[PDB]
């Protein structure tokens, strides 16, 4: 059965220079496999945490990873207009890969927020449903082939959702509920990542993000260390 990944709280309201601490609950037991995600207010994704405590590159040492078994949490120290963002937990233990629903940090007053891979998706639009799209993402900065790549959806309701990934050596992985209907593939000459997607369904309507896995710990655990910004697709019948 899949793994259910638990935030409590959707949104946590602090002041500057408040420590906050965020909660993750595993339906099981994830053997520490436990990354973190930050997406800024105007959408932008970066990894933040991965291996339950290790810090991406450029970010600081105020983000305080811990936890085990099926508890994790996400300390924030010293929060800074640039911390106001919603913080999403993600196992990479099993397969599907699955997120929490997201925990955003907001201040006491309204308002808030502040600021070489390059992943550029492209070929998203609008179809009816039954319809067809093939995305695209142009991948630059890194030697592209030995690194594994998905796809990772956020819906119009805020939930990132795994679509699907390849590996460097082209071994392919789908959450279930696109199996058949999309094929991930790689141009390793080009460094192209694509997603076909056939027989659209209104619920594929989301942001699609091309994200550059990286291992973190043999056989399959991995890390979503960069994304693109995402190109939208939109499935309706008013289309
Ligand atoms: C059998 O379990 C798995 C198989 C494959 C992946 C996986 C996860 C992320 C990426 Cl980027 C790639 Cl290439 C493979 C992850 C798991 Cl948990």
């Known amino acids: 059965m899949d793994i259910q990944m638990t935030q409590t709280a959707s949104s946590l309201s602090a002041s500057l220079g408040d420590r906050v601490t965020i909660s993750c609950r595993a339906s099981?037991?994830?053997?520490?496999?436990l990354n973190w995600y930050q997406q800024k207010p105007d959408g932008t994704v970066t990894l933040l945490i991965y291996?339950?405590?290790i810090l991406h590159s450029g970010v600081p040492s105020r983000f305080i990873g811990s936890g085990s078994g099926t508890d994790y949490s996400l300390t924030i120290s010293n929060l800074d207009q640039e911390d106001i963002a919603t913080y999403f937990c993600?196992?990479?233990?099993?397969?599907?890969?699955?997120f929490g629903a997201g925990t955003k940090l907001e201040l006491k007053r309204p308002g808030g927020g502040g600021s070489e891979v390059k992943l550029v998706e492209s070929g998203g639009g609008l179809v009816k449903p039954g319809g067809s799209l093939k995305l695209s993402c142009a991948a630059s900065?890194?030697?592209?082939?030995?690194?594994?790549m998905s796809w990772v959806r956020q819906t119009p309701e805020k939930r990132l959702e795994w679509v699907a990934s390849?590996?460097?050596?082209?071994?392919?992985y789908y959450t279930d509920i696109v199996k058949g209907r999309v094929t991930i593939s790689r141009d390793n000459d080009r460094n192209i990542l694509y997603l076909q997607m056939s027989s659209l369904r209104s619920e594929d309507t989301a942001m699609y993000h091309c994200?550059?896995?990286?291992?973190?710990?043999?056989?399959?655990?991995?890390?979503?260390?960069?994304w693109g910004q995402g190109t939208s697709v939109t499935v309706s019948s008013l289309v």
């Open positions: 993600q196992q990479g233990y099993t397969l599907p890969l699955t």
């Open positions: 900065g890194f030697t592209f082939s030995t690194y594994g």
């Open positions: 994200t550059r896995g990286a291992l973190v710990r043999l056989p399959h655990y991995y890390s979503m260390d960069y």
């Open positions: 390849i590996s460097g050596g082209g071994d392919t």
């Open positions: 099981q037991y994830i053997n520490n496999y």
């Open positions: 291996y339950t405590s």
